[PDB]
Amino acid sequence: LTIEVLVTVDGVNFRTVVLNNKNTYRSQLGCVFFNGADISDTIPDEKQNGHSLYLADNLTADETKALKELYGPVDPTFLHRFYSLKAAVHGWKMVVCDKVRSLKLSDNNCYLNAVIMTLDLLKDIKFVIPALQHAFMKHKGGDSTDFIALIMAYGNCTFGAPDDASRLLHTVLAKAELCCSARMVWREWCNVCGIKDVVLQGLKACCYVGVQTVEDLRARMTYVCQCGGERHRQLVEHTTPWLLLSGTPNEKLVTTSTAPDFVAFNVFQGIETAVGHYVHARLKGGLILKFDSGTVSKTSDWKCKVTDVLFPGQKYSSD
Amino acid sequence: EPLSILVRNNKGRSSTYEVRLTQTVAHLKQQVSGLEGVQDDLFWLTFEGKPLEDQLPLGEYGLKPLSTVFMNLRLRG
Ligand SMILES: [Zn+2]
Ligand SMILES: [Zn+2]
Ligand SMILES: [Zn+2]
Ligand SMILES: [Zn+2]
Ligand SMILES: [Zn+2]
């Protein structure tokens, strides 16, 4: 009336646990997952003997050590959140609208449709964390369940609740690196302190939160210096394979008649102080493709509050 | 050992915060949530265009005295 299971965190290093048919998994061991299903509140029996189960709580040091090697410097709550978010998202589906892949509306997941479709245009990024890169490679192959749940868990997103696409998009990118060169040089100066050049490289030179157009990124900025005066800062060199600018929702009239410079952008519908709706947009063949969570429609002109704006490559040098 | 940095709100007002580079940004976020009347789930912080992740220490971001961190409203779409 006893069974032996193998608990694992990485699917490679296992550790056995003897369990009885009297108490449930949660009281004897902790929360466990079997073939993607939570069985923590079920009583063990013969159909579990010999099989491996993914432990989520109550990890030991050596399973915690392996956890940090697979997911990075994560918090004890992380593994439970990830495993639970993955099973809750099982019902969600990616639907092909106009030759691309988009995420259907379910449980307020439209902010995620904006994040994933914007990432899908960045075709030169990889993730340094192994689990994340594995999920990301699976998403690009068809099954996006892992990748969706992971960015949800890394972004501290609660299930079925609306969130901020620019927050999540830039948080996720902070875990990524670029497969090519990229360079961004800031010139800071202060009439009392002096002149100094700050250099950023790689993927960090392709994202910025605070401006939504390339003119505003290249504008001279002024803020308080450590001396008390006003320090100045201005971009003097920029070479990237693409540029992602994000800001608060800003009303604009985007039109294809003037042939805009950006290739894609995200839109917030509603007012900023309430629950709104996200729509992803790309420009292809002289039109705007609007992607509202599993559906697509085209327009020539659109008055809309944009948030994230994705530009092509940057070859810039001034002063 | 602690130093003074600035967090700026949507309205443009900077406030001083005594912090340590070994503190987490989750700790700074609770100081910011205390000075203004906003809760942590309603905003996120940026420095030099990049977001600050909750579980990381401030020293990971290169903050010097009177560095200006920005408060960004966490949208709900
Ligand atoms: Zn548990
Ligand atoms: Zn549980
Ligand atoms: Zn100065
Ligand atoms: Zn000033
Ligand atoms: Zn001035």
UniProtKB/TrEMBL annotation, chain A:
Cellular location(s): Host cytoplasm, Host perinuclear region; Host endoplasmic reticulum-Golgi intermediate compartment; Host membrane
Ranges of residues in domain Peptidase C16: 70-319
Domain Ubiquitin-like, residue spans: 1-55
Residues binding Zn(2+) 1: 190, 193, 225, 227
Superkingdom per UniProt: Viruses
Subunit composition and interactions: Interacts with nsp8 to form the replication-transcription complex (RTC): nsp12, nsp7, two subunits of nsp8, and up to two subunits of nsp13. Interacts with proofreading exoribonuclease nsp14 and 2'-O-methyltransferase nsp16; these interactions enhance nsp14 and nsp16 enzymatic activities.
Sequence similarity: Belongs to the coronaviruses polyprotein 1ab family.
Record function comment: Plays a pivotal role in viral transcription by stimulating both nsp14 3'-5' exoribonuclease and nsp16 2'-O-methyltransferase activities. Therefore plays an essential role in viral mRNAs cap methylation. Forms a hexadecamer with nsp7 (8 subunits of each) that may participate in viral replication by acting as a primase. Alternatively, may synthesize substantially longer products than oligonucleotide primers.
Protein name: ORF1ab polyprotein
Classification lineage: Viruses, Riboviria, Orthornavirae, Pisuviricota, Pisoniviricetes
Name of the coding gene: orf1ab
